[PDB]
């Protein structure tokens, strides 16, 4: 037993990380088969970022403006193209360490592991969630651009995130691996800001279940609520609404514990309206919303 | 920027994980060069655990009672010996994936990454600390015995923990890789219990520094305290005492932020005596004590 913020084992992704240099800018790239993926702003100057025309900047570049190094061995760039906001660097060698992989776009509320990298070298791994406002609260220093987020199913790596930038609020924004940004964010120097964030209600419920599974029951109560009456209270607290789909997804946790979802909802309603009163759940004094129902099942069984 | 519970990249350790079976018991082993390390209770029966004589049980075993599988390929056990509470299984093949490694014993308060494994297969990675009472608050299900904890320095894996058991309080106990238990715990079915835990003061201070580094300053104050006056208050709250060594170790964080340790200590003293009053630090409503000074430096630079 126990409950921890748990990332996926990162080995399969470490074998794909490379260093990509263009001009005086170095950042990370993802090397799968004979393609290297990286943020397209790798070709930009600080002057360019104020109003880049990326198709114009990239056309003024040649393959030899791109230095790719997989550890020591330099990779020869034999061709380059743009896919939305990622750059695709064709290289002569297929990565022998290429895992089975897919490119998947995730939904707000879903979680993924991040392998933070610098100069193509992995430095740490952590779990986070796509916030409802399409930012992630990551840990990223200058040079981490190109670090990826991923899930693992069986032996297959679903890449879902490439890191592009930090917003002025200290949160982070990037794209899926097809180069499409999560959220209304752009790879240009503008006055971008994250919208209003909300709490991921279905995840808070999953985490209350995880607590019950782990012997924390002080917050449980005898009451039950209706979906509508729950939503009417939670939205007052900037909680995402809960759907019948959410209730279905929470089914297996409801079964393992024998507590109906709407029963648990009454607990969460009570916790929202009363606070926690110096008590903790699973070692936390706040309601935790970055564990999905699947993460709980995974870890608690 | 940002601050996350961050584990080390786990690839180098995933290549060492194997499955070890003996009787009807399967658990995990660590395969380095031509040796496989695993908990010695792998040879025990439930009946045996009540009073095992391990040197006697192991003598009644032969190499062929030990099935080691590295993925598919079975490994032939050509010899076996005991080192304290770990079992060393000599095998004919050196692990080609053996990283540079050391066996290191850590101190209460130090952190490490755990690669939780089942049937020799890695399932997740998370960061935790050796508690002052020599337990760890891990996430472990039946079958995780033999999962290891580790740090990484440059390319060198310092293995520091092998998982052996869960205590009745839900916390976990194991050994260093030389088979010596952390704490007063034994691999026998007895009435073992963890002692009284305390908070790792030097780590809480490091985390307050991490918060300052990340723009959270509401808890700072104009006061300064003496080491002695700080300890006199903290020990009242079940906080470990702070030493001059701790103050030295916090030096680089003090420098980067320009806040003297004893200055920060006055903040922590105030937070202990006043609570947090519905405020949070780095997204937490509790004082966090599982980041060392080194972890903060690592992540914040």
Swiss-Prot record, chains A, B:
Q: Where is the active site?
A: 41 (for 3cl-pro activity), 145 (for 3cl-pro activity)
The record's catalysed reaction(s) read: TSAVLQ-|-SGFRK-NH2 and SGVTFQ-|-GKFKK the two peptides corresponding to the two self-cleavage sites of the SARS 3C-like proteinase are the two most reactive peptide substrates. The enzyme exhibits a strong preference for substrates containing Gln at P1 position and Leu at P2 position
Q: Which residues form the Peptidase C30 domain?
A: 1-301
What is the activity-regulation note?
A: Inhibited by pyridone-containing alpha-ketoamides compounds 13a and 13b. In turn, alpha-ketoamide 13b (tert-butyl (1-((S)-1-(((S)-4-(benzylamino)-3,4-dioxo-1-((S)-2-oxopyrrolidin-3-yl)butan-2-yl)amino)-3-cyclopropyl-1-oxopropan-2-yl)-2-oxo-1,2-dihydropyridin-3-yl)carbamate) inhibits SARS-CoV-2 replication in human lung cells. Inhibited ex vivo by michael acceptor inhibitor N3. Inhibited ex vivo by compound 11a and 11b.
Q: Give, from the UniProt record, the effect of changing residue 90 to R.
A: In strain: Beta/B.1.351
Location in or out of the cell = Host cytoplasm; Host Golgi apparatus; Host nucleus
Superkingdom of source = Viruses
Q: Which residues lie on this side of the membrane: Cytoplasmic?
A: 1-301
Instruction: Describe the task this protein carries out.
Output: Cleaves the C-terminus of replicase polyprotein at 11 sites. Recognizes substrates containing the core sequence [ILMVF]-Q-|-[SGACN]. Cleaves and inactivates human TRMT1, preventing tRNA guanine(26)-dimethylation of tRNAs. May cleave human NLRP1 in lung epithelial cells, thereby activating the NLRP1 inflammasome pathway. May cleave human GSDMD, triggering alternative GSDME-mediated epithelial cell death upon activation of the NLRP1 inflammasome, which may enhance the release interleukins 1B, 6, 16 and 18. Also able to bind an ADP-ribose-1''-phosphate (ADRP).
Describe its assembly: 3CL-PRO exists as monomer and homodimer. Only the homodimer shows catalytic activity. Interacts with host FBXO22; this interaction promotes the proteasomal degradation of nsp5.
Report the protein name in the record. Answer: 3C-like proteinase nsp5
- In terms of the parent sequence, the fragment covers 3264 to 3564 of 4405
